[PDB]
């Protein structure tokens, strides 16, 4: 037992991280087969970054201007193209460590692990959620761009995020591996703000189920509620509406514990209306919304990769 | 910016995990050079585990009774011995993925990453602290034993923990890689309790420094205090005493922010006496003590491996 914020093992992703330098700017790249993927602002100088015209900047660069290194070894670039906000650097060597992989665009509320890297080398791994406002609450410094977020299923790495920037409240924004941003954000240094966030209701419920599995049961009351009535209260506290789809996804946890989803909703409704009166749930004094229902099942059933 | 609970990249440790089966019991092993390290209770049946005599149980086993698998590949065992609470299985093949490594016994208050595995395969990675009562707050299920905790320095993996058991409050206990338990615990299934824990004061202070680096500054007051006076208040709230050694270790963070350690202690003293009045620090409603001063510097300065 016990319940922790767990990241995926990072080994399969570690074997794909490279360093990309163009002129004076250096960031991380993702090396899969014979293509290196990296953020397109590697071709900017500091002054370019206020309002860059990337198509123009890139037309002035050739293959040899891109210095790609895997550890010590330099990889020779033999082609390049721009896909939305990412660079695709074709190299003369296929990465022998390339895992079975896919590129996915995740949905708000879904979690992934970030492998934070600098100069092509990994610094740490941590679990993140795509927030409803299309940011993530990460930990990123200068040079971290090109770091990627991922999920693993069996042997397959689903890449879903590549890091590009940091927004005014210390939140972070990026793209899928096709270079399309999550959210209304653009890769230029002008004033940009995240929209107001909301709490991921389905994930809070999953986490309450995780607490019951671990024997933290004080918050369960004797009531039930309708889906419509619960959502009326969730609205007032800045929680996303709960859908039948969400209810269906909580099915396995509900069946395992014998607590109907709407009974759990009744208990959550009380927590929202009454607070926690100084108590904790799974060690936390606030309700946690960065565990999906799958995350809870993976961790409480020991799914391996 | 941003501050997250960060684990070390797990790739170097992933390459060493194997599955060890003896009779009907299966758990994880650590394969370094031509030796597999695993918990000694792999040789017990369920009934043995109430009060096992391991020296007796092991005298009745030979090399071939140990089935060691690295992925699909079975490794042939050519020797075996018991060192305290661990088994040392000599195999006829040296692990080609063996990283540069050391075996360390960490101190209470120090952090490490756990790579949780089942059947020799990794399930997740998370950061842990050795508590003052010599437990860790982990997430472990049946079959997780043999999972290891580690730190990385440059290229060197310092292994410091191997998992053995779970104590009544959902806390976990284990050994160093020499088979010696952290704490007064024994690997047998009889009633055992952790002693009362305490809060790691030096780590809370490090985390408050991390908050200032990230611009969360509301809790800084205008006061200072003596080391003796602070520790008088820490005692009453179940915090470890702060030593000059701890003060010296907070030096880099103090110098970086320009806040003397004893000024920080004054602010911590107020938090303890007054609470947080509904506010959060770095997103947390409770004070966090599982970040060492090094952890804060690594993450805020982007140390890579
Ligand atoms: C790439 O390594 C960095 C990662 C940043 C640095 C601080 N923490 C991070 O997550 N990305 C940038 O420096 C990025 C380059 C642009 C060309 C996209 N710029 C920013 O993140 C800036 N943000 C903005 O201007 C804002 F988000 F629009 F507000 C700052 C001001 C440098 C953070
Ligand atoms: C090895 O895979 C497991 C890991 C356990 C299982 C539940 N979560 C874990 O961390 N270790 C054991 O099953 C262990 C075997 C003994 C021979 C050491 N036994 C225990 O952890 C038991 N604990 C105790 O009897 C106690 F800690 F002394 F109280 C339980 C009751 C199975 C947890």
XYZ file of C-alpha atoms and ligand atoms in Angstrom:
676
model
C 0.000 0.000 0.000
C 0.821 3.703 0.016
C 0.122 6.192 -2.748
C 2.755 8.342 -4.445
C 3.002 10.685 -7.409
C 4.657 8.170 -9.744
C 6.418 8.940 -13.020
C 7.009 6.427 -15.782
C 10.473 4.852 -15.953
C 12.459 7.222 -18.140
C 15.019 4.849 -19.667
C 13.371 4.470 -23.064
C 13.138 8.266 -23.413
C 16.648 8.874 -22.048
C 18.086 6.989 -25.016
C 16.551 9.506 -27.439
C 17.679 12.837 -25.962
C 20.219 14.874 -27.898
C 21.607 18.396 -27.767
C 20.880 20.797 -30.635
C 22.938 23.964 -31.112
C 22.301 26.546 -33.830
C 24.593 29.551 -33.656
C 24.653 30.502 -29.970
C 21.366 28.911 -28.834
C 21.331 25.347 -27.473
C 18.376 23.187 -26.446
C 17.302 19.545 -26.423
C 16.196 17.345 -29.295
C 14.356 14.032 -29.566
C 16.183 11.538 -31.805
C 13.882 8.881 -33.302
C 15.091 6.691 -36.174
C 17.030 9.158 -38.391
C 15.122 12.344 -37.430
C 15.795 14.813 -34.601
C 12.787 16.786 -33.320
C 13.378 20.075 -31.463
C 11.687 23.447 -30.846
C 11.998 25.831 -33.769
C 13.218 28.758 -31.700
C 16.682 27.111 -31.601
C 17.294 29.237 -34.712
C 16.609 32.530 -32.886
C 18.977 34.869 -31.160
C 17.732 36.660 -28.043
C 16.694 39.673 -30.128
C 14.888 37.457 -32.648
C 12.718 36.069 -29.856
C 10.612 39.219 -29.377
C 8.865 38.792 -32.741
C 10.527 36.120 -34.895
C 9.683 35.251 -38.477
C 10.750 31.614 -38.389
C 10.214 30.848 -42.071
C 12.573 33.736 -42.819
C 15.096 32.749 -40.141
C 15.099 29.140 -41.369
C 15.525 30.005 -45.064
C 18.884 31.521 -44.066
C 20.097 28.279 -42.436
C 21.503 25.151 -44.074
C 22.079 21.592 -42.868
C 25.583 22.278 -41.551
C 24.466 25.187 -39.337
C 22.728 22.692 -37.001
C 25.132 21.045 -34.550
C 23.490 17.904 -33.138
C 25.346 15.861 -30.509
C 24.388 12.541 -28.899
C 26.659 12.510 -25.873
C 30.110 13.084 -27.324
C 29.182 11.933 -30.828
C 28.186 14.600 -33.331
C 25.382 13.585 -35.698
C 25.666 14.974 -39.219
C 22.509 16.718 -40.417
C 21.490 15.880 -43.989
C 18.073 17.573 -44.161
C 15.775 19.929 -42.311
C 12.180 21.139 -42.379
C 9.757 22.988 -40.126
C 6.443 21.452 -39.038
C 4.387 24.065 -37.149
C 6.566 24.958 -34.117
C 9.067 22.070 -34.316
C 12.177 21.410 -36.371
C 12.675 18.035 -38.059
C 16.416 17.472 -38.546
C 17.180 14.478 -40.752
C 20.472 12.889 -39.704
C 22.710 10.343 -41.411
C 22.443 7.887 -38.471
C 19.355 6.130 -37.148
C 19.127 6.070 -33.361
C 19.713 2.413 -32.399
C 17.951 3.050 -29.069
C 14.720 4.139 -30.753
C 11.831 2.536 -28.827
C 8.509 1.556 -30.294
C 6.719 4.883 -30.146
C 3.769 6.992 -31.219
C 2.999 10.716 -31.297
C -0.264 11.534 -29.498
C -2.052 14.776 -28.669
C -3.436 14.307 -25.161
C -6.664 15.754 -23.776
C -7.016 18.208 -20.881
C -7.021 16.310 -17.604
C -4.668 13.539 -18.737
C -1.304 12.952 -17.096
C 2.179 12.288 -18.434
C 5.767 12.152 -17.227
C 8.249 14.886 -18.137
C 11.928 14.055 -18.549
C 13.570 17.410 -17.860
C 16.862 17.752 -19.727
C 19.613 20.319 -20.223
C 22.242 20.172 -22.978
C 20.805 16.843 -24.128
C 21.339 15.259 -20.648
C 18.531 14.302 -18.250
C 18.102 16.155 -14.960
C 14.977 14.564 -13.491
C 11.587 13.009 -14.147
C 8.191 14.024 -12.757
C 4.495 13.485 -13.412
C 2.348 16.275 -14.856
C -1.241 16.901 -15.918
C -2.486 18.818 -18.929
C -4.532 21.462 -17.160
C -7.955 22.510 -18.488
C -6.362 25.820 -19.579
C -3.726 23.898 -21.608
C -0.740 24.630 -19.361
C 1.275 22.278 -17.184
C 2.683 22.875 -13.719
C 6.282 21.903 -14.366
C 9.826 22.774 -13.334
C 11.805 24.198 -16.255
C 14.827 26.513 -16.526
C 16.679 28.194 -19.378
C 17.869 25.476 -21.749
C 15.127 22.996 -20.824
C 13.242 23.424 -24.104
C 12.997 20.281 -26.190
C 12.333 18.257 -23.052
C 9.409 15.942 -23.749
C 6.460 14.457 -21.908
C 5.365 10.884 -22.487
C 3.268 7.908 -21.461
C 4.218 4.230 -21.758
C 1.851 1.394 -22.662
C 3.493 -2.047 -22.514
C 6.555 -1.349 -24.693
C 5.242 1.668 -26.616
C 6.221 5.248 -25.740
C 3.464 7.742 -26.568
C 5.124 11.147 -26.851
C 2.610 13.905 -26.193
C 4.479 17.097 -25.211
C 7.618 19.033 -26.084
C 8.520 22.022 -23.920
C 8.673 25.552 -25.360
C 8.050 28.283 -22.782
C 7.014 29.595 -19.368
C 3.958 31.820 -18.667
C 3.630 34.585 -16.017
C 2.558 32.481 -13.011
C 5.361 29.946 -13.352
C 3.284 27.661 -15.564
C 4.489 26.071 -18.765
C 3.262 25.683 -22.328
C 4.319 23.561 -25.259
C 3.368 21.538 -28.298
C 2.621 18.012 -29.348
C 5.314 16.344 -31.443
C 3.665 17.726 -34.599
C 4.575 21.223 -33.398
C 1.018 22.335 -32.588
C 0.633 24.195 -29.323
C -1.573 23.056 -26.513
C -3.688 26.160 -25.964
C -3.836 29.593 -27.616
C -0.148 30.244 -27.100
C 2.535 31.249 -29.626
C 6.316 30.818 -29.433
C 7.274 34.478 -29.215
C 8.254 36.629 -26.244
C 5.278 38.943 -25.900
C 2.766 39.262 -23.097
C 0.693 36.083 -22.880
C -1.476 34.797 -20.042
C -3.044 31.445 -19.286
C -6.800 31.464 -18.975
C -8.359 30.713 -15.620
C -7.804 27.078 -14.692
C -10.343 24.621 -13.292
C -10.086 21.514 -11.129
C -10.215 18.161 -12.935
C -13.231 16.606 -11.216
C -12.834 13.056 -12.563
C -9.256 12.961 -11.251
C -10.216 14.107 -7.743
C -12.778 11.290 -7.625
C -10.176 8.767 -8.814
C -7.874 9.971 -6.043
C -10.610 9.618 -3.414
C -11.037 6.032 -4.633
C -7.276 5.576 -4.199
C -7.659 6.802 -0.612
C -10.359 4.207 0.119
C -8.192 1.449 -1.368
C -5.489 2.598 1.079
C -7.895 2.634 4.037
C -8.289 6.431 4.320
C -12.070 6.366 4.611
C -13.151 9.164 6.995
C -14.684 11.347 4.276
C -17.258 8.789 3.071
C -20.754 9.892 4.085
C -24.047 7.987 3.952
C -25.547 9.973 1.049
C -25.927 9.756 -2.720
C -26.696 12.462 -5.271
C -27.779 12.937 -8.850
C -25.254 13.818 -11.528
C -27.100 17.083 -12.204
C -27.123 18.134 -8.537
C -23.430 17.338 -8.016
C -22.458 19.364 -11.075
C -24.455 22.319 -9.732
C -22.139 22.360 -6.712
C -18.991 21.603 -8.717
C -19.671 24.689 -10.863
C -19.613 27.006 -7.853
C -16.196 25.694 -6.748
C -14.484 25.854 -10.177
C -14.645 22.109 -10.897
C -15.187 20.772 -14.418
C -18.593 19.202 -15.032
C -18.727 15.449 -14.567
C -19.966 13.634 -17.672
C -21.363 10.135 -18.089
C -18.120 9.368 -19.946
C -16.230 10.271 -16.767
C -18.606 8.116 -14.703
C -18.029 5.183 -17.063
C -14.248 5.624 -16.777
C -14.492 5.443 -12.962
C -16.251 2.080 -13.365
C -13.286 -0.167 -12.500
C -12.486 1.758 -9.307
C -16.169 1.829 -8.328
C -16.493 -1.914 -8.909
C -13.291 -2.659 -6.997
C -14.347 -0.704 -3.888
C -18.098 -1.234 -4.101
C -18.786 2.515 -3.946
C -21.068 3.844 -6.663
C -19.684 6.884 -8.486
C -22.634 9.026 -7.391
C -22.083 8.011 -3.764
C -18.475 9.204 -4.126
C -19.845 12.397 -5.671
C -21.977 12.906 -2.562
C -18.867 12.634 -0.385
C -16.900 14.994 -2.638
C -19.801 17.462 -2.531
C -19.552 17.532 1.274
C -15.771 18.070 1.187
C -16.311 21.040 -1.126
C -19.091 22.562 0.978
C -17.512 21.845 4.380
C -13.755 21.743 3.818
C -11.494 19.182 5.435
C -11.424 20.682 8.972
C -7.687 20.186 9.365
C -7.623 16.548 8.259
C -5.693 15.058 5.363
C -6.509 12.524 2.666
C -3.561 10.337 1.627
C -1.302 12.807 3.425
C -2.636 15.823 1.506
C -4.458 18.790 3.039
C -5.863 19.785 -0.380
C -7.789 17.679 -2.860
C -5.516 16.256 -5.583
C -6.497 16.288 -9.265
C -3.352 15.119 -11.113
C -4.095 11.365 -10.918
C -6.261 9.922 -13.671
C -8.417 6.844 -13.002
C -5.842 4.853 -15.002
C -2.995 6.251 -12.874
C -4.758 4.983 -9.749
C -5.302 1.513 -11.212
C -1.750 1.264 -12.607
C -0.237 2.126 -9.246
C -2.631 0.175 -7.010
C -2.386 -2.931 -9.240
C 1.324 -2.729 -10.117
C 1.183 -2.378 -13.903
C 4.673 -2.770 -15.384
C 6.276 -1.840 -18.699
C 10.817 28.309 -12.613
C 8.372 26.036 -10.814
C 9.204 23.431 -8.197
C 8.315 19.746 -8.450
C 9.058 16.530 -6.594
C 11.687 15.274 -9.048
C 13.064 11.742 -9.280
C 16.369 10.827 -10.873
C 16.239 9.467 -14.429
C 15.804 5.732 -13.975
C 17.446 4.406 -17.147
C 20.736 3.339 -15.585
C 18.864 1.397 -12.882
C 16.312 -0.054 -15.319
C 19.116 -1.903 -17.093
C 19.963 -3.814 -13.900
C 16.549 -5.134 -12.823
C 15.935 -8.866 -13.038
C 13.318 -11.305 -11.796
C 14.287 -13.920 -9.198
C 12.099 -16.973 -8.576
C 12.821 -19.629 -5.953
C 10.167 -22.316 -5.722
C 6.869 -20.416 -5.788
C 8.068 -16.988 -4.591
C 9.148 -14.344 -7.120
C 10.647 -10.902 -6.519
C 13.113 -8.485 -8.099
C 16.892 -8.638 -8.214
C 19.644 -6.127 -8.963
C 22.132 -7.432 -11.547
C 25.564 -5.771 -11.315
C 28.553 -7.275 -13.136
C 28.099 -11.049 -12.578
C 26.181 -10.867 -9.262
C 22.424 -10.622 -8.645
C 21.347 -9.000 -5.359
C 17.860 -9.740 -3.979
C 16.014 -9.998 -0.641
C 16.682 -13.244 1.187
C 13.036 -14.035 1.831
C 12.747 -15.184 -1.819
C 13.603 -18.601 -0.348
C 10.569 -18.620 1.984
C 7.129 -20.016 1.456
C 4.204 -18.137 3.001
C 4.343 -20.359 6.091
C 8.107 -19.867 6.422
C 7.586 -16.109 6.637
C 6.112 -16.108 10.161
C 9.439 -17.072 11.758
C 12.024 -18.139 9.165
C 15.464 -19.554 9.845
C 17.154 -18.344 6.675
C 20.503 -20.055 7.212
C 18.576 -23.322 7.478
C 16.316 -22.567 4.505
C 19.324 -21.608 2.368
C 21.408 -24.682 3.257
C 18.650 -26.727 1.587
C 18.921 -24.792 -1.703
C 21.476 -25.150 -4.493
C 22.461 -22.965 -7.444
C 19.901 -24.482 -9.816
C 16.950 -23.811 -7.482
C 17.264 -20.062 -8.226
C 15.596 -19.063 -11.501
C 16.938 -15.657 -12.575
C 15.553 -14.030 -15.734
C 16.621 -10.806 -17.465
C 13.633 -10.143 -19.689
C 13.202 -13.376 -21.615
C 16.777 -14.555 -21.069
C 17.412 -16.904 -18.163
C 20.703 -16.318 -16.339
C 22.401 -19.451 -15.035
C 23.340 -19.244 -11.358
C 26.814 -20.566 -10.530
C 27.113 -19.514 -6.873
C 25.153 -18.122 -3.962
C 25.716 -16.664 -0.505
C 23.795 -14.690 2.098
C 25.008 -11.304 3.360
C 22.786 -10.152 6.251
C 19.287 -9.883 4.696
C 20.268 -10.060 1.002
C 21.118 -12.885 -1.369
C 24.162 -12.627 -3.641
C 23.582 -14.847 -6.689
C 26.697 -15.268 -8.819
C 25.732 -15.727 -12.467
C 27.718 -16.899 -15.482
C 27.064 -13.632 -17.393
C 28.155 -10.117 -16.484
C 25.468 -7.491 -17.012
C 26.686 -5.423 -19.991
C 24.451 -2.541 -18.852
C 26.156 -2.287 -15.463
C 26.644 1.429 -14.704
C 29.424 2.886 -12.632
C 27.984 2.402 -9.169
C 28.549 2.392 -5.430
C 26.701 0.973 -2.424
C 25.999 3.645 0.207
C 24.106 3.644 3.495
C 22.254 6.960 3.604
C 21.481 9.035 6.691
C 18.032 9.927 8.045
C 16.716 12.987 6.245
C 18.369 12.232 2.900
C 16.358 11.628 -0.254
C 16.554 9.054 -3.028
C 14.526 7.818 -5.979
C 12.767 4.447 -5.877
C 12.309 2.442 -9.066
C 9.291 0.300 -8.216
C 9.356 -2.999 -10.103
C 7.297 -6.174 -10.380
C 8.529 -9.425 -11.941
C 11.803 -7.713 -12.845
C 9.972 -4.988 -14.875
C 9.707 -1.326 -13.838
C 6.342 0.160 -12.886
C 7.241 3.711 -11.866
C 9.779 6.016 -10.258
C 9.310 8.402 -7.328
C 11.361 10.390 -4.833
C 11.531 9.340 -1.180
C 13.168 10.432 2.064
C 14.699 8.262 4.755
C 12.545 9.315 7.681
C 14.077 9.933 11.123
C 12.417 6.681 12.289
C 14.143 4.764 9.442
C 11.045 4.131 7.321
C 10.122 5.521 3.923
C 6.736 6.666 2.669
C 6.560 4.624 -0.512
C 4.090 2.807 -2.744
C 4.751 -0.939 -2.773
C 2.580 -4.004 -3.454
C 3.082 -7.757 -3.234
C 6.014 -8.667 -5.471
C 7.703 -5.259 -5.218
C 10.517 -6.506 -2.976
C 13.972 -6.187 -4.478
C 13.054 -2.772 -5.849
C 15.908 -0.395 -5.073
C 16.410 3.244 -4.179
C 19.288 5.247 -5.594
C 20.973 8.587 -6.158
C 23.011 9.633 -9.202
C 26.132 11.807 -9.141
C 27.469 12.626 -12.619
C 27.636 9.085 -14.050
C 27.747 7.126 -10.782
C 24.683 5.381 -9.330
C 24.778 5.230 -5.524
C 22.443 2.419 -4.487
C 21.203 2.966 -0.948
C 17.986 0.960 -0.423
C 16.441 -2.379 -1.332
C 12.796 -2.953 -0.430
C 11.754 -5.701 2.004
C 8.469 -4.993 3.794
C 5.534 -2.808 4.821
C 4.756 -1.659 8.405
C 1.298 -1.092 9.987
C 0.663 2.514 8.889
C 1.442 1.898 5.227
C 5.111 2.781 5.660
C 7.994 0.773 4.290
C 11.270 -0.643 5.563
C 14.313 -2.130 3.910
C 18.059 -2.567 3.824
C 21.141 -1.097 2.264
C 22.748 -3.213 -0.448
C 24.836 -4.981 2.218
C 21.604 -6.435 3.612
C 21.563 -4.380 6.824
C 18.197 -2.938 7.753
C 17.530 0.730 8.155
C 16.033 0.804 11.642
C 15.306 -1.859 14.272
C 13.298 -3.987 11.880
C 13.671 -7.683 10.988
C 12.499 -9.548 7.880
C 9.882 -11.748 9.515
C 6.102 -11.435 9.675
C 5.508 -10.607 13.321
C 4.103 -7.476 14.899
C 6.494 -4.578 14.325
C 5.880 -0.842 14.598
C 7.803 2.197 13.446
C 8.834 4.577 16.181
C 7.319 8.033 16.262
C 8.561 10.086 13.326
C 9.816 13.674 13.361
C 9.939 16.446 10.773
C 13.269 16.982 9.000
C 13.925 20.614 9.920
C 16.852 21.238 7.550
C 14.726 20.056 4.616
C 11.791 22.338 5.462
C 14.211 25.280 5.503
C 15.677 24.222 2.144
C 12.148 24.098 0.744
C 11.337 27.573 2.081
C 14.470 28.777 0.275
C 13.141 27.094 -2.877
C 9.905 29.052 -2.420
C 11.789 32.364 -2.239
C 13.760 31.481 -5.378
C 10.367 30.939 -7.052
C 8.974 34.247 -5.763
C 6.689 32.809 -3.052
C 7.791 35.231 -0.348
C 4.767 36.046 1.857
C 6.026 34.105 4.883
C 9.277 36.066 5.330
C 9.070 38.223 8.456
C 11.393 40.983 9.674
C 12.890 38.998 12.580
C 15.932 36.872 13.373
C 16.503 34.341 16.145
C 19.239 32.411 17.876
C 19.851 28.769 17.048
C 19.075 27.811 20.654
C 15.760 29.699 20.719
C 14.588 28.276 17.380
C 15.341 24.732 18.511
C 13.304 25.327 21.677
C 10.263 25.924 19.467
C 11.120 23.156 16.995
C 11.140 20.651 19.878
C 7.548 21.445 20.821
C 6.337 20.815 17.249
C 8.198 17.509 16.683
C 10.965 18.961 14.490
C 14.530 17.638 14.632
C 17.051 19.987 16.235
C 18.937 22.198 13.812
C 22.708 21.783 14.086
C 25.527 24.031 12.914
C 26.247 21.309 10.340
C 22.731 21.837 8.978
C 23.265 25.614 8.974
C 26.521 25.173 7.049
C 24.773 22.944 4.492
C 22.140 25.656 3.892
C 24.991 28.058 3.074
C 24.656 27.990 -0.730
C 20.904 28.664 -0.624
C 21.385 31.410 1.975
C 24.104 33.046 -0.120
C 22.039 32.789 -3.303
C 18.961 34.474 -1.790
C 20.697 36.777 0.675
C 18.633 35.450 3.596
C 20.641 34.362 6.619
C 19.750 30.888 7.890
C 18.694 32.273 11.275
C 16.417 34.807 9.577
C 14.768 31.890 7.750
C 14.517 30.125 11.108
C 12.644 33.140 12.475
C 10.138 32.879 9.621
C 9.765 29.118 10.094
C 9.231 29.672 13.826
C 6.294 31.969 13.027
C 4.765 29.449 10.597
C 4.928 26.809 13.330
C 3.429 29.055 16.010
C 0.796 30.699 13.785
C -0.002 28.196 11.040
C -0.472 29.181 7.421
C -3.984 30.711 7.731
C -5.251 29.033 4.578
C -2.338 30.050 2.356
C 0.017 27.769 0.462
C 3.762 27.725 -0.115
C 4.804 26.400 -3.537
C 1.272 25.050 -3.912
C 1.387 23.107 -0.631
C -0.856 23.718 2.381
C 1.568 21.826 4.660
C 5.280 22.361 5.145
C 7.351 19.960 3.011
C 10.386 18.119 4.396
C 11.368 15.657 1.631
C 13.660 18.047 -0.296
C 17.270 18.220 0.845
C 19.297 21.411 0.319
C 21.062 19.582 -2.533
C 17.710 18.628 -4.097
C 16.735 22.305 -4.161
C 20.021 23.362 -5.764
C 19.994 20.508 -8.309
C 16.496 21.395 -9.449
C 16.788 25.195 -9.337
C 20.162 25.115 -11.153
C 19.436 22.286 -13.611
C 22.079 19.734 -12.622
C 22.220 16.930 -15.199
C 23.586 13.386 -15.204
C 13.388 27.131 -23.672
O 14.506 26.494 -23.072
C 12.802 28.193 -22.759
C 12.219 27.572 -21.490
C 11.788 28.604 -20.446
C 12.899 29.452 -19.818
C 12.340 29.771 -18.446
N 11.584 28.564 -18.150
C 11.092 27.986 -19.241
O 10.201 27.122 -19.285
N 11.784 28.956 -23.485
C 11.922 30.274 -23.681
O 12.845 30.929 -23.195
C 10.853 30.966 -24.524
C 11.364 31.228 -25.941
C 10.316 31.764 -26.912
C 10.909 31.981 -28.291
C 9.123 30.826 -26.986
N 10.421 32.203 -23.901
C 9.754 32.205 -22.741
O 9.423 31.168 -22.160
C 9.373 33.571 -22.171
N 7.930 33.641 -21.995
C 7.192 34.591 -22.556
O 7.596 35.543 -23.191
C 5.682 34.447 -22.355
F 5.363 33.220 -21.990
F 5.016 34.702 -23.465
F 5.236 35.250 -21.413
C 10.154 33.949 -20.874
C 9.799 35.383 -20.469
C 11.662 33.867 -21.125
C 9.794 33.012 -19.716
C 7.990 -8.117 -0.747
O 7.539 -8.067 -2.092
C 6.896 -7.700 0.219
C 6.517 -6.232 0.025
C 5.290 -5.805 0.834
C 3.956 -6.457 0.455
C 2.946 -5.394 0.838
N 3.685 -4.172 0.560
C 4.995 -4.314 0.737
O 5.831 -3.404 0.841
N 7.333 -7.952 1.593
C 6.664 -8.803 2.384
O 5.610 -9.343 2.042
C 7.247 -9.066 3.770
C 7.968 -10.413 3.809
C 8.729 -10.696 5.101
C 9.422 -12.045 5.043
C 9.734 -9.593 5.385
N 6.212 -9.013 4.786
C 5.580 -7.870 5.079
O 5.865 -6.794 4.548
C 4.492 -7.944 6.151
N 4.810 -7.024 7.232
C 4.921 -7.423 8.493
O 4.700 -8.535 8.924
C 5.369 -6.343 9.481
F 5.921 -5.321 8.855
F 6.266 -6.802 10.332
F 4.355 -5.862 10.170
C 3.049 -7.739 5.594
C 2.035 -7.969 6.719
C 2.771 -8.740 4.469
C 2.860 -6.319 5.050
